[PDB]
Amino acid sequence: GSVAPVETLEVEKWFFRTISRKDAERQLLAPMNKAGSFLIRESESNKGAFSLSVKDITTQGEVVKHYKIRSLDNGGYYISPRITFPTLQALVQHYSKKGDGLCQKLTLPCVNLA
Numbered sequence: 001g002s003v004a005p006v007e008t009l010e011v012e013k014w015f016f017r018t019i020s021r022k023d024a025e026r027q028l029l030a031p032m033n034k035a036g037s038f039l040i041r042e043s044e045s046n047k048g049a050f051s052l053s054v055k056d057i058t059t060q061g062e063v064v065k066h067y068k069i070r071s072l073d074n075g076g077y078y079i080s081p082r083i084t085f086p087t088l089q090a091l092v093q094h095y096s097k098k099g100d101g102l103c104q105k106l107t108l109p110c111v112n113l114a
Contacts, residue, residue, distance in 0.1 A: 013037065013110035025053055027114045035057050036107030038106060067101075072084065083101060
């Protein structure tokens, strides 16, 4: 195209592997990040399911979030049954414009160096 196609593996602080629960949470809960940085970790039990942590900001201290991602044979991923996606990038992208499903939309993934 134009100085780009040359080993461009995507590994941003959004599409993570099956990090531990508290781990993904430890990262989001970092004071560098806030509501919007996410972790879509894979459920290391199911051959196709995932999970997603987001920082939640409440008066009862700063926490994370937990949204269950399913994998449909003809619907990619879905968290709210009123809205399905083909991959998590298109899921996260859609949620990157508003807070349709999540109460706090996506801003910026987590910072490097946990």
